[model samples]
Target: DSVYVQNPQIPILVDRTDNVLFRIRIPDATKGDVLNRLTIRFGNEDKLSEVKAVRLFYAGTEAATKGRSRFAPVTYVSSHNIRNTRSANPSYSIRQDEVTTVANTLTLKTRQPMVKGINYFWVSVEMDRNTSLLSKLTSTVTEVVINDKPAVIAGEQAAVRRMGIGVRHAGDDGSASFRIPGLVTTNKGTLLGVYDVRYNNSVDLQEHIDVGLSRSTDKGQTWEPMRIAMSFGETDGLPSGQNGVGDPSILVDERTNTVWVVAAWTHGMGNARAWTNSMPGMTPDETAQLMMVKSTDDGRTWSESTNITSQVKDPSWCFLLQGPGRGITMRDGTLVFPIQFIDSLRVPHAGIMYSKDRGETWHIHQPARTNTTEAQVAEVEPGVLMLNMRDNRGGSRAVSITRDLGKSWTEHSSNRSALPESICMASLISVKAKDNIIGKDLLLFSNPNTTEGRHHITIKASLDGGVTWLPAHQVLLDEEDGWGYSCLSMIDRETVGIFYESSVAHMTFQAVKIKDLIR
Candidate 1:
């Protein structure tokens, strides 16, 4: 019923190419109301041209009931006057009795009726490509004048909030900093938050790190105290920094109400790195080990560490470890942990190590594709599984799908084109249309949408499984720089939760309503 304000200082680059200058959201409106005009406050150096289009979208009425409801544009204004000036502050006044015109104001004469539910206004622009254009195009305010009353501003109420901050610090047998978030919603509707408890420093393994867990029963409104869920004991006679376990990935089996967390444990030797370091024909003592722990009572308490290197890894391989993100359970009840291993030659690749009999036994399936690492998996269909990975080759993400549970694989259509990243870890999970129900296929992926630095954290949706991802269906969560690791899960039927590294907090979580992501 009211307008929302978003990031005010965020700048949108404008060169020869077209760019989205602003995205305005108009929340539910009362019936019998009519929109009359739109006033946009902005700043730029040179005189700007008209925008590409001012499109108004209305999400289908079946949004709450249906999964992946695409947005349909109800109306649009093709061209509108965009007043620009070089003055520091300008006034835009029209009436003879009023003052001078305001400096950077664009008043568009638009009229439309009120919608019952949410509505979105997308403003796209193409700036003049002259060298005289000094200042970039940035939007400060967008007001919708409706019913001849005070204008309503476009805003987002529940923006990203910081979490897991200076609540705890170093040298207290715990991590001073936290990184790499992996979130999962258990069958009991409990939110389990997992990450690296970097004790001494924020460096990766071969340091003092442990897999830590935080639980939230109130839909992440509050979280319980942190606890070391998986740790390597101090019996190695070396310093605590010498023995480390980190890069945690979590999974929940709804059938048994069991929770499993997997990480890589450095056994005090610290000979090789857990992610990319490797040496041929290395023994167990010379490399990282795949370790795991589980909880039966909804993540209240976790069992001791169990090393499963021999069962699911090759000793001759240079390195082997679980992907440092969330895992998935197939439709047939197979517990799959997306894994990566470096061959004896130090070449990185991704695959899966799944368990059919609960967490008792495991096997390493064939590799999905070569030259890939740090991946996540989701079952796109009844028996189809897609592995979206971080390409070591850089610039973009690599994807492959398997119909027979990793026995054979095929490259996805949007493998390197649909989503692009700057060689960083990403998160993927399939959310059901209804909670605790199967076969509702809606796949969500999260990562920084860039080909260079780690910025532009975004979430994208795929309607027809993982085959195609429309650019219109993506949402930008954060446009700043950070460690760039993200994990996503459905907090409830109406909300989707994301825990990632951001400029605000070490690990931050922002809940976005499913309605906001319709288009």
Candidate 2:
């Protein structure tokens, strides 16, 4: 009966096995007591049919007391009827078939005894590949005993369910982590999600990170296998760390039916920070390079790297990168991407990059104010491009308007006032109003709607393009803190599908209907 708490924003992704249902400590355990049986009571009996398997893992470390104490890579037992086991060794991990929920309960057995300072329970599960996305799955400890009759109750765990698909997990595709996701819908209605495949670990750029993609043809109900959208690999006899390419912004050219992924390829950023040490230059030995990769078959496959640094990069800027999210193709088929660059003085600003002649040549605009970074672009009207930005000053966002492809800028009335932030990257996208309400075009916004930490990821609707966000049009998704970055796309006429960095998984995708957004 210690702390029976759990992370509130946990996600039970479709077909994603080994998701933690509850992690807790059993209090007042006898030092020499032999561990016996553990029974877990399901919260919703109807939802238990989607559970494919259940696992119990234990570690003696202080993992249960931390904020991000995830499942230890230790041997776990997936049986409910095993009696005596002696060690948490490798051979003890017995594989079992899909679990049968008996009276809304699952009982587990561990062979190891209750060692001192080792009272943690790591209860996890694998959902059926075809689990429903509408309802959530939950579990709690109803009965647990060292030998026979002491209770270890569970509490505060959020229900996990689907519609929320874990598009990219940490260990997917031989990668240790994933981040900076960009999602765009193709002309063929395929979802092309791009992100950083952090191979070594969950560190920022200057690591073994590459751009990867996940294609969903069924409107994100399911995704195809992962694809490497872009990877610079080793260049100029340098290791991957010195040549890592990341911070991708993906978009679709509706006119050409081509999908493109743009990212910043940093060279010689090894050991040093990308912000300070990536000096001003155009080559691999110099600063960051702007790179792009494209796919002609929707998102089935991608092309190799094409260095566009010389086309748009200023040789004097310290660092430059695309939005780290999805970009936009204007109504006139002009390809555009939100951009951020650090000046020679190391000041960051938000701007735009556009290729007017179908990506043959590209040009960039001047920055809005200093102290802004990773942003998104959307054509509010015909040629009115609104650049929504993340301010380093924190608390709120900055907005800028550009009619001549950022040749000039004006701070909109909503700058630093309309949207709230916690100093994390956000996403902005535009979609037409579904017939009757709102405005002609409703601007979709996704970010952590807080003045402090990176929690409370919300989607706010703006009726007057980029003007004002009414409270009634906002939808709160995950209230727990995560990487706090997101992107939006029109899944169809009524659905707004989003991919984001969430507390539950490396990247999570959820669908929101337009009818619920407008009053």
Candidate 3:
């Protein structure tokens, strides 16, 4: 007998007639077997189907191409494909159009949300098995719902009131884009100032970097551009060939009316230099030195040449040993410069370094744990400090508190929340709101509410200081992107400024105010 192979018929849609039912089926089968073995996967499912291929006998007959897949060509919105593609990994648009499959017998659930026209989405079906024949194969259906179209929510729609999203181009080449945006109270000023990496990092192109700042007039709202608070030009007055300010961290010293920006200066390509050289278009840039500058005014003008880390010693490969963090000014006028020391650039470890004599001198302190990154600390009480941090190994982002300023810290404590994205740069503060149910007296955390990438940016309030926290309100600032490695500072009682990066092609900055964020 000659072996046979056939493509399954075009997917068909059928209704049971009892109510609104969407289903899929394979007709060429014994009547009773239709619902027996076939599986209909649907509603954000992750599964693959497998089937047998026809074994051919005669050699002269035309044969289908080898290794050709018999599965249906994948369309735009399949859940599996969404997980595989990079751009889709940071999806921000809503999905439109219907993907109907009757053979799969996918049942609709009332809880499943609808995909509005202006939203963005993707859909698809595939087959598994060693051969190309998938005639009797079944299917799985998944639905993603983006509520209506993406709305900017700027202007009156925003709670902290007046605001502006600033876009500035970095790099001498102009292809690099930088942004400084934040929430502004029509009467107050800007609350938060965010910064981000805005262009494609190519071995082939100049590395666009991130540097920014945030200021508040009436505490948190009504703000200013978080300018390229810090950048590098060729020491010889030439353009930067290998340019970057890796891990830029900022702070607003309300007591002195000044802002401090710190970053790891890489001479060539930044943290990814060694890895980029092996790729098609990347070159390695060397950075054997660490530098810092100061401004007596709030970013009005910075001192000419300041080198705080010059005496430190490390290998060229160890050049990226340091990254940036915010500073906490002690009540007695001592400025605590917040800095994270990364021993391994490949995967960051958590450590702290601070400046006491007005940014003229410093101290380095490492956490008990070695595998952490994107850390933030704040002075909750006069000598009591709170440390909020994320790790590379595993576990949700966590926190610890220190009573002796930066001399020591509490054991890494897990805040009871699911921080969706990897927990790096989780911002912390000492505030008490109605939301701070647990401590209502200590520390507050702002992290993602979901395991999903961009669920939105949130603020969790704690009362005791940095011990326990309560679930708090979040602000959906960007449409598809969430805040990452964000820095936040409490200007006073009612105002706070957040500095963070959006995980988008244009990693622009956003400054958000804490007071008006809930609405």
Q: In TM-score terms, which candidate is top?
A: 2
Which should have the higher TM-score, number 1 or number 2? 2
Per-residue lDDT value at 367 in model 3: 53
Off by over 4 Å in 2: 1-7, 18-99, 102-126, 134-163, 434-440, 516-519
Q: What RMSD does model 1 have?
A: 15.9
Tell me the lDDT of model 2 at 366.
87
- Candidate 3 segments exceeding 4 Å error: 1-175, 179-227, 236-239, 269-288, 311-325, 344-347, 404-407, 415-421, 431-442, 452-454, 472-479, 503-519
Instruction: State the lDDT of candidate 2 residue by residue for 1-519, as single tens digits.
Output: 333535344455664556556565654455665446677776655577667677776654344455333323343422111221111233533322224454487777776666554456666677677775544655556666666656655466544433377787666666878898889989888988888988887778788888889998887778888888888777777888777788899989989889888998877766656777778878867888898888888888788878888988898998888878988888888999888888889899889999988777888978866899988888888889988899998888999899999999989899999898988888898876552244357889999889898788888988787788999998777776678889888887777888999766677888877777885
lDDT per model, in order?
Answer: 0.66, 0.75, 0.39
Residue 380, model 3: lDDT of 72
C-alpha TM-score for every candidate = 0.68, 0.78, 0.55
Worst 10 residues of 1 by lDDT: 79-88
Model 1: per-residue lDDT, tens digit, 1-519?
A: 455444322222222122223445555666655556556565554234433222222222224443322222221211111221111111211111111233467655444555665554444343333212123344554666668775656454233221122112222233457888899999878988899988666788778878888888876655688888988767467666777888899999867879999998776555345555544333445777788899998999999888788787777777888888788877789998899998877778898888989989988878888889899999877777889999988888899998877888999987987888899999898876665233345788899889988778888877778677777767776675667898999887766778777533456666666555553
Query: Is 1 or 3 the stronger prediction by TM-score?
Result: 1
lDDT of 3: 0.39
Show how many residue pairs clash in every candidate, following the order shown. Answer: 12, 1, 52
